[PDB]
Design a protein around this ligand. Structure first.
Ligand SMILES: *[C@@H]1O[C@H](CO)[C@@H](O[C@@H]2O[C@H](CO)[C@@H](O[C@@H]3O[C@H](CO)[C@@H](O)[C@H](O[C@H]4O[C@H](CO)[C@@H](O)[C@H](O)[C@@H]4O)[C@@H]3O)[C@H](O)[C@H]2NC(C)=O)[C@H](O)[C@H]1NC(C)=O
Ligand SMILES: *[C@@H]1O[C@H](CO)[C@@H](O[C@@H]2O[C@H](CO)[C@@H](O[C@@H]3O[C@H](CO[C@H]4O[C@H](CO)[C@@H](O)[C@H](O)[C@@H]4O)[C@@H](O)[C@H](O)[C@@H]3O)[C@H](O)[C@H]2NC(C)=O)[C@H](O)[C@H]1NC(C)=O
Ligand SMILES: *[C@@H]1O[C@H](CO)[C@@H](O[C@@H]2O[C@H](CO)[C@@H](O)[C@H](O)[C@H]2NC(C)=O)[C@H](O)[C@H]1NC(C)=O
Ligand SMILES: *[C@@H]1O[C@H](CO)[C@@H](O[C@@H]2O[C@H](CO)[C@@H](O)[C@H](O)[C@H]2NC(C)=O)[C@H](O)[C@H]1NC(C)=O
Ligand SMILES: *[C@@H]1O[C@H](CO)[C@@H](O)[C@H](O)[C@H]1NC(C)=O
Lengths: 224, 219, 213
């Protein structure tokens, strides 16, 4: 059962090189061509290059000519993408893709596309740093209050936020992190609750950041 | 004439098998040991005797097929090969035998494989690929050669070690000329892909006095 | 070979019907044209190959069509899971090109944001920075303007904002704006205001606080 399995995420500093591998699995008759396409955060999908493992012939897109190298390991059924002189705008999910004939009819056949699961590459000059978690303290009586948690200044993504150990999920919003000019990430998570619960319901936000083993249980209370 | 190939293919089990209809030297053989281990060599079967009468895993020589009938083109992917023992191609017809030329798209299209063993017939057996990449084969009908035990052999080929009259003319049911040899033909590496490293030999076969010059792939 | 999708966005309701377009600068060989559904944080999922062929599992409510230069993807009856971004791709040559996408969001009655402002905590002020957070909660459509005013001076260049995906239960958006100053600047001024402009608001709404009260 065809499966293209790519190597795990990596974080490289600018000017460095990365080598992503894509391993073919589950073929009875192997495919002939392997493409790599890139998807930068926010932007679209971009083709990078094709390799024919049998011949070794590679053809790279411009924009990547001179910094990309497609290589093969036909005995291993592994294809490699190497990007060098890494810039910050090379942060993206890199996908290996391989066409295969799906079906035939009336004398012609039609190819489909099999996809690896994606390899994320983050390019940052930053170093692993856990977050500082500050409260967003509630400001009514029979209305709705907002409270929250500011998870500031960490690297790399991701952090996870939950409320009262998972017992509070409704009304929660954990916003997408923003990248600050310092190269560190920042995020807020908020919840709305009945005003009449303030000073009564205990609200704790549970922040976890595995890259640094940071784990924080911030009580959020109305400010005095 | 290429238009008479039934080409109703659909790789819905995601094997890449349709590639081999076009490109060459692409077969992954890692699974062949576990499959070929299910084919017992002739020596393990029971010696037969008495008069001969006529009775899965089609990559085993001892696979005992059913007689060939008529099959709907919708279930056929690629050329059908029958064996006289010489390899010949059978194309699509309508249900009354008229050749058709629409790649087997029509629901009325069939492949009429109905076989009688030569010399008074057409061919010994046929092999082909169904729509999702399974090798199918028909022919014979194979021979009941008698014998006792649970390792009794329904002979579909030349099994003369186990019965002196179980020759290919008597029992042949497809492309296996002996338990080690099968007819070479342009799609053998697709239909029987585990025979990839078999050696090709020039052979001669006689069927009711007709000489067949053909290449056999043997192991 | 440039592929140009249209419309750029589309607002519809579940059970209604959606029609996306892909027009190609040159003609596309073999009709090797694919459509993908791109949901946030998920790998692109193939919906259609060879212009008209559903991929395995793709429900019957998706169908593709077209030839040469004009291709179309149609969604019969929109379900909740069908709202996303959709990309077209030609692969008739070795040099693949993609379209730039089409977002399909749930259309909904106009809903004005609830606005809250949050002063920096004393814990952060000890460290020398102040972040002021303004929250715009559960609004539609997603166009919203947030302006920070510090002693009535419209700020710029010192705030970042981020928006949630459309909500699976009420189809609203929520937005968070953070203004970051140094403790010293933060202590120079008194009135910190968040001013929100949105369609469901008859006039801009302001939330504010005076530092230290
Ligand atoms: C190409 O050839 C392959 C190999 O022959 C062929 O695969 C076989 O398909 C049949 C039918 O789709 C499968 O048979 C089914 O097996 C399962 C598991 O045992 C059963 O649950 C199924 O039950 C049906 O039939 C019963 C009566 O026998 C009913 O009571 C029941 O409710 C179901 O209707 C059924 O027997 C078989 O397992 C596969 N085998 C393999 C190896 O895949 C394939 O279908 C052919 N493809 C084409 C395009 O024809
Ligand atoms: C290549 O082969 C593929 C595998 O067969 C083909 O994909 C199959 O195509 C058929 C025809 O569209 C699909 O059959 C449909 O199945 C759905 C399933 O829906 C569910 O609900 C119904 C009742 O509403 C129920 O009966 C089912 O059990 C399901 O739980 C039905 O709604 C349709 O009426 C129809 O039966 C197969 O599902 C589909 N399989 C997959 C996984 O894609 C493919 O079409 C072939 N390709 C070509 C080019 O021919
Ligand atoms: C070549 O075939 C082998 C045997 O089928 C494949 O290895 C199997 O891979 C599947 C799916 O990953 C596993 O479930 C099996 O247990 C594996 N078995 C063995 C014998 O290793 C292998 O993936 C195929 N190689 C290529 C290039 O597709
Ligand atoms: C060729 O074989 C087919 C079987 O596949 C024969 O058609 C069958 O005929 C029998 C009666 O003799 C019927 O009971 C079956 O229902 C038929 N089935 C099909 C699939 O057609 C066909 O008659 C045979 N032709 C010859 C030369 O005998
Ligand atoms: C055929 O031979 C090749 C080496 O020439 C080997 O790697 C492959 O596994 C062989 N296949 C079988 C089924 O013997």
């Amino acid at each position: 059962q065809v499966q293209l399995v790519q190597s795990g995420a990596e974080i490289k500093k600018p000017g460095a090189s990365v080598k992503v591998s894509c391993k073919a699995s589950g073929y009875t008759f192997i495919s002939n061509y392997f493409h790599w396409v890139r998807q930068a955060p926010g932007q679209g999908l971009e083709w990078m290059g094709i390799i024919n493992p049998s011949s070794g012939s590679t053809t790279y897109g411009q924009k990547f000519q001179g910094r990309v190298t497609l290589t093969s390991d036909t005995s291993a059924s592994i294809v490699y993408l190497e990007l060098s002189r890494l810039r910050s705008e090379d942060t993206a999910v890199y996908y290996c893709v391989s066409p295969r004939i799906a079906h035939c009819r009336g004398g012609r056949c039609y190819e489909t596309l099999d996809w690896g699961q994606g390899t994320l590459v983050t390019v940052s000059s930053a170093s692993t740093k856990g977050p500082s978690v500050f409260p967003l303290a509630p400001s009514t009586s029979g209305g709705t209050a907002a409270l929250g948690c500011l998870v500031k200044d960490y690297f790399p993504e991701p952090v996870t936020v939950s409320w009262n150990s998972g017992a509070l999920t409704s009304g929660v919003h954990t916003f997408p992190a923003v990248l600050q000019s310092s190269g560190l990430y920042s995020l807020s998570s908020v919840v709305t609750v009945p005003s009449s619960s303030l000073g009564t319901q205990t609200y704790i936000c549970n922040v976890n950041h595995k890259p640094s083993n940071t784990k924080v249980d911030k009580r959020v209370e109305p400010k005095s | 004439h290429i238009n008479r190939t039934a080409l109703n293919c659909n790789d819905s089990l995601h094997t890449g098998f349709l590639a081999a209809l076009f490109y060459t030297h692409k077969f992954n053989a890692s699974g062949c040991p576990e499959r070929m281990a299910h084919c017992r060599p002739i020596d393990e079967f029971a010696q037969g005797w008495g008069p001969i009468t006529y009775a899965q895993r089609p990559y085993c020589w001892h696979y005992a097929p059913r007689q060939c009938g008529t099959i709907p083109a919708s279930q056929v992917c690629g050329p059908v090969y029958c064996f006289t023992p010489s390899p010949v191609v059978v194309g699509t017809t309508d249900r009354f035998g008229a050749p058709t030329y629409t790649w087997g798209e029509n629901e009325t299209d069939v492949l009429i494989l109905n076989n009688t063993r030569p010399p008074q017939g057409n061919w010994f057996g046929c092999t082909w690929m169904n729509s999702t990449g399974f090798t199918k084969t028909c022919g014979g009908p194979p021979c009941n050669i008698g014998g006792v035990g649970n390792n009794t052999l329904t002979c579909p080929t030349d099994c003369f070690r186990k019965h002196p009259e179980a020759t290919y003319t008597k029992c042949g049911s497809g492309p296996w000329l002996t338990p080690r040899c099968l007819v070479d033909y342009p799609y053998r590496l697709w239909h029987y892909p585990c025979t990839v490293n078999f050696t090709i030999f020039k052979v001669r076969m006689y069927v009711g006095g007709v000489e067949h010059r053909l290449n056999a792939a043997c192991n | 070979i440039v592929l140009t999708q249209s419309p750029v966005s589309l607002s519809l309701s579940p059970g209604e019907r959606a029609t996306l377009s892909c027009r190609a600068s040159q003609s596309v060989s073999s009709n090797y044209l694919a459509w993908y559904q791109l949901k946030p944080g998920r790998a692109p999922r193939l919906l259609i190959y060879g212009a008209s062929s559903r991929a395995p599992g793709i429900p019957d409510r998706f169908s593709g069509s077209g030839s040469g230069t004009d291709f179309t993807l149609t969604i019969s009856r929109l379900e909740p899971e069908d709202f996303a971004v959709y990309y077209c791709q030609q692969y008739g040559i070795s040099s693949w090109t993609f379209g730039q996408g089409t977002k399909v969001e749930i259309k909904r009655t106009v809903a004005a944001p609830s606005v809250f402002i949050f002063p920096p905590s004393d814990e952060q002020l000890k460290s020398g920075t102040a972040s002021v957070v303004c929250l715009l909660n559960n609004f539609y459509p997603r166009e919203a303007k947030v302006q920070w005013k510090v002693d009535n001076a419209l700020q710029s260049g010192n705030s970042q904002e981020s928006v949630t995906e459309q909500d699976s239960k009420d189809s609203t958006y929520s937005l968070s704006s953070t203004l970051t100053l140094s403790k010293a600047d933060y202590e120079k001024h008194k009135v910190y205001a968040c001013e929100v402009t949105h369609q469901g608001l008859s006039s801009p709404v302001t939330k504010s606080f005076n530092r230290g009260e």
